[PDB]
Design a protein around this ligand. Structure first.
Ligand code: CDL
Ligand code: CDL
Ligand code: CDL
Lengths: 65, 61, 145, 209, 150, 50, 99
């Protein structure tokens, strides 16, 4: 956020002013069943990317491969 | 411009064994073919946004 | 191999003090017992590697079958499926249009923009325009979301 | 002792002679230095890591024998061998399957070893210098085709521009000062000759082709 | 419906794909290829029944090694399915699929036959965002061989 | 913050007028009642889960 | 100003559920055809386009590639050099850029 052009006074996420805070997940089963941390490995490239390989199969036949 | 580009939601897999409701419900789900419509943004999964109806259980911090 | 001894102190007699000279041998005896197992496993491990080399040629043909398919037009590699219902799909599409139409207030710093007091002193008097109150923001086609 | 330590001794045979025979028995700081770096068998030379594997290998292997040594679920179905009523026979192959899956414990460790990581978001944060990125970074991308095709396109066309650039300079060299100052000039320009001066016509200042 | 067809244009042997045929007829073709195993499996039963009825009731084959008796039933089983497949195709089906392919494009070589579900296309903004094969990377065209007639 | 020692969360009701409409003698009447119900919730839980 | 502040231009309905905050529905959301229906619908367009829309295509592609140029003077040069001496307004009508 600093590199993106936003200078930061203070530190942390315990916002003293008029902002919403997000405390850490309470380490008790009640909250551990409703919530779970974001797994970065689940953010993926859309598989539509693989449909671009259709161009390759057509060019290969056009060139007689 | 940077904030705007960042709200364009990313793609998040529906597969989830961490939430016990999905751990059970997805065992009975039927995977149907998603026929390509000519785009690169088909939301065939859930979206990586806290306000999505299938991602609200995830903690974005 | 012979070890050089500075001879600063006399070593104990092996006959009178034998336990002091034993640990070295039992350590190598352990390693030798391990080597007997490494050698005895030459055929078991080799048979596996031989199977990997044979299995390698079937995987090559299955990859081409998986990617190119029957007639070189594409195989199951181009297939993609989903568990989302029809409502879930059109909900996500409208979720994309909403975030495309989700802006933040105040835009960027006007002080980082060209001043009207400066254009005057440069030779151009800007013309003041009115607000366009008749335009409605809408999302583009799905292909651009 | 192990073979690797014996190899060091053969290599350090002359060093052992200098430090032990000559230095170690000298007085003063030269002796303290030799007796300190004396060469021989290692005091406290055991390797705890190697010993740790041996312990965990033996402890986990005894668990494999218990989990794998089970009565068959198949043989208990006929009610003719050793098992008439076994209401939990369907649990017989749970631990064996669990132990066999342990062979992939290290092969599949972490996220990158369970998928093609370049298609996952964490891979990007690593290529950006372990820097946090917006979650939609995998989508806001320029076509890889354009980047590589345009790099070839631009270079292939520069080769054709170099040839055209030569014919233009050649044809302009045979042009009069009047033409090279009136052609492509503004209509409102009135040509006025300049004093003739000697200015070489060098294509490439550096002696290049 | 992903099926490659082999049609006879007189002396030529041409090839096509069901994806190149209207969906109204793809169902009629798929329904034909769905009745083949029931005619194949059905014929294997007769060849297995008639063979078992002969190697047992006829006291000339029953007085033979079991290996010879088992080979007849095994040979008659799959053989009864192949015969059923021929009667299924040759009767009125092999000629019907050819009729259902009337109007479809054909090709001289199987390698030239495209799968419509595998072709690349884009949504043309200049044509109401309709799907188009004539994408901005196209050069020449498709240029199939001919339209099938029967 | 009324239970914190040297609180620095001055924006969390520390510099605001915070009254209520509950019974007075809070630590003698209200606060014990919250602990009484607490003991009921946990005793009813132990007896049930056990 | 609040960091988690967003201005939305289309209606949204938020869920009134405990411990969760999300958009559960969009007012007046119509479910279009399924992916399998649009697929079949598109196959019919690609099929007719494959059989009846391939003749005279090489000429139209040259016109389309010429009209993707930056300046008009280069388009005219592209048409005269690559499209066999085609007219600017005559090609714009073929492509559908004329009113
Ligand atoms: C070119 C090749 C040449 C080929 C010829 C060469 C021939 C060489 C032969 C070599 C010998 C091969 C070894 C096998 C034969 C040996 C002969 C013999 O007598 O065996 C006795 C032998 C003696 O027992 P043992 O020595 O004491 O111990 C044996 C085991 O260690 C432990 O024994 P166990 O009995 O304890 O293990 C039991 C285990 C054995 O492991 C398995 O087999 C796994 C089974 C999992 C699948 C079970 C399917 C259940 C029914 C499904 C029905 C639908 C099917 C549809 C399938 C569609 C597929 C998409 O199965 C179970 O776990 C039982 C419980 C399973 C859960 C039951 C749940 C039922 C309810 C489910 C309801 C949900 C659906 C409801 C929907 C309702 C809607 C109507 O027992 C065996 O059978 C050994 C088999 C062990 C596996 C060996 C495999 C070796 C590797 C070979 C390659 C792999 C091939 C196998 C593929 C199988 C398909 C995946
Ligand atoms: C890579 C290659 C892969 C190849 C794979 C494909 C090829 C595999 C081949 C498999 C067959 C190999 C074995 C065949 C050679 C057998 C040669 C032989 O010597 O046998 C006679 C031999 C006679 O012994 P013997 O004492 O020395 O004979 C002295 C005198 O002849 C004794 O004097 P006798 O007067 O007392 O005569 C006794 C004789 C009497 O023999 C007879 O009279 C023949 C009667 C047979 C009637 C079968 C038709 C029944 C239905 C009739 C219905 C009519 C009424 C209702 C009509 C309503 C219509 C809707 O005994 C019998 O043989 C009767 C056995 C009855 C078997 C019934 C099995 C029913 C299965 C039904 C499903 C069939 C599916 C076919 C699959 C096709 C599609 C894949 O007995 C045997 O060796 C038994 C062999 C084991 C039986 C094999 C049959 C299958 C058993 C397992 C069940 C599998 C069924 C399939 C289920 C699949 C569905 C999921
Ligand atoms: C010649 C004659 C000369 C003399 C004639 C005149 C004599 C004097 C006549 C009296 C005139 C009226 C007095 C007016 C001045 C009051 C000034 C004052 O400071 O009062 C503040 C005090 C608090 O009021 P406040 O601060 O203004 O707040 C206003 C609202 O309350 C605020 O509203 P809120 O709802 O928010 O408040 C909640 C409410 C909560 O609701 C309640 O009121 C709680 C009630 C639960 C307890 C009720 C049972 C009490 C009696 C049990 C004993 C039964 C024994 C027999 C059982 C027989 C069964 C059939 O109130 C409280 O929380 C109060 C908590 C503070 C009191 C608790 C701690 C007291 C310590 C007790 C230890 C006693 C040990 C002995 C020590 C003796 C020396 C100090 O006022 C009173 O509590 C009035 C007390 C009246 C006495 C009631 C009967 C007591 C009987 C005790 C019998 C045992 C001793 C036997 C002696 C026998 C002698 C013959």
């Amino acid at each position: 956020t600093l590199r993106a052009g936003k200078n930061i006074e203070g530190s942390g996420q315990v916002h003293f002013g008029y902002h919403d805070q997000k405390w850490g997940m309470p380490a008790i089963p009640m909250f551990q069943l409703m919530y779970y941390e974001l797994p970065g490995n689940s953010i993926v490239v859309n598989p539509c990317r693989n449909q671009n390989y259709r161009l390759y199969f057509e060019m290969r036949k056009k060139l007689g491969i | 411009a940077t904030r705007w580009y960042g709200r364009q939601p990313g793609h998040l897999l529906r597969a989830d064994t961490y939430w016990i409701p999905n751990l059970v419900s997805q065992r009975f789900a039927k995977h149907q073919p998603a026929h390509w419509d000519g785009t690169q943004n088909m939301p065939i999964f859930r979206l990586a946004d806290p306000k999505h109806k299938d991602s609200y259980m995830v903690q974005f911090r | 191999p012979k070890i050089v001894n500075p001879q600063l102190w006399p070593n104990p007699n092996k006959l009178r003090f034998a336990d002091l000279y034993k640990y070295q041998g039992v350590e190598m005896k352990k390693i030798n017992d391990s080597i007997k197992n490494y050698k005895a496993a030459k055929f078991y491990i080799g048979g596996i590697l031989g199977g990997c080399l044979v299995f390698k040629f079937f995987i090559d043909a299955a990859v081409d079958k998986y990617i190119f398919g029957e007639n070189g037009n594409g195989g199951k590699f181009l297939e993609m499926q989903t568990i989302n219902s029809n409502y879930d799909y059109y909900y996500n599409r409208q979720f994309q249009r909403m975030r495309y139409l989700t802006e933040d207030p105040a835009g960027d710093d006007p002080l980082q923009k060209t001043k009207d007091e400066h254009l005057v002193d440069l030779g151009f008097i800007p013309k003041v325009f009115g607000a366009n109150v008749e335009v409605r923001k809408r999302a583009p086609h799905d292909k651009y979301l | 002792m192990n073979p690797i330590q014996k190899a060091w001794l053969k290599i350090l045979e002359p060093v052992s002679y200098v430090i032990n025979e000559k230095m170690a028995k000298r007085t003063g700081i030269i002796g303290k230095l030799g007796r300190f770096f004396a060469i021989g068998p290692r005091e406290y030379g055991v390797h705890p890591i190697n010993r740790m594997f041996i312990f965990m290998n033996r402890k986990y292997m005894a668990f494999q024998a218990v989990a794998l040594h089970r009565y068959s679920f198949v043989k208990s179905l006929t009610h003719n061998g050793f098992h008439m009523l076994r209401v939990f026979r369907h649990f017989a192959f749970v631990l064996p399957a669990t132990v066999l899956a342990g062979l992939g414990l290290f092969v599949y460790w972490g996220d990158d070893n369970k998928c093609y990581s370049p298609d996952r978001f964490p891979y990007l944060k690593k290529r950006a210098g372990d820097m946090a990125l917006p979650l939609n970074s995998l989508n806001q991308r320029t076509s890889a085709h354009y980047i590589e095709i345009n790099a070839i396109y631009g270079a292939e066309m520069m080769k054709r521009y170099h040839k055209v650039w030569e014919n233009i300079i050649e044809e302009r060299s045979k042009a009069t000062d009047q033409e090279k100052k009136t052609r492509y000039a503004h209509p409102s320009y009135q040509y006025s000759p300049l004093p003739v001066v000697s200015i070489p016509n060098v294509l490439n200042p550096l002696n290049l082709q | 419906s992903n099926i490659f067809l082999e049609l006879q244009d007189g002396d030529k042997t041409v090839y096509t794909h069901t994806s190149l045929i209207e969906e109204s007829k793809q169902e009629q073709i798929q329904a034909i290829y769905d009745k083949v195993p029931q005619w194949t499996n059905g014929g294997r039963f007769l060849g297995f029944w008639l063979s078992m009825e002969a190697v047992n009731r006829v006291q000339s084959v029953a007085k033979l090694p079991i290996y010879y008796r088992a080979g007849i039933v095994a040979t008659s089983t799959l053989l009864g399915g192949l015969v059923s497949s021929l009667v299924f195709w040759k009767s009125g089906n092999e000629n019907q699929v050819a009729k259902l392919a009337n109007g479809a494009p054909v090709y001289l070589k199987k390698w030239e036959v495209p799968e419509l579900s595998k072709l690349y296309f884009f949504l043309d903004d200049d044509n109401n965002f309709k799907p188009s094969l004539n994408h901005h990377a196209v050069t020449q065209g498709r240029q199939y061989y001919k339209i099938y007639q029967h | 913050n009324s239970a914190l020692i040297g609180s620095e969360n001055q924006s969390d009701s520390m510099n605001e007028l915070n009254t209520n409409f509950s019974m007075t003698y809070y630590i003698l009447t209200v606060l014990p009642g919250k602990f009484i119900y607490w003991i009921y919730e946990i005793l009813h839980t132990f007896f049930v889960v056990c | 100003m609040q960091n988690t502040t967003n201005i939305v231009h289309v209606p949204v309905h938020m869920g009134h559920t405990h411990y969760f905050d999300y958009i559960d529905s969009f007012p007046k959301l119509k479910e279009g055809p399924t992916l399998e229906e649009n697929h079949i619908t598109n196959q019919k367009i690609l099929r007719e386009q494959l059989i009846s829309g391939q003749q005279g295509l090489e000429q139209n592609l040259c016109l389309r590639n010429c009209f993707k140029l930056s300046q008009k003077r280069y388009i005219e040069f592209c048409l005269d050099r690559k499209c066999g001496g085609a007219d600017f307004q005559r090609a714009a009508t073929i492509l559908g850029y004329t009113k």
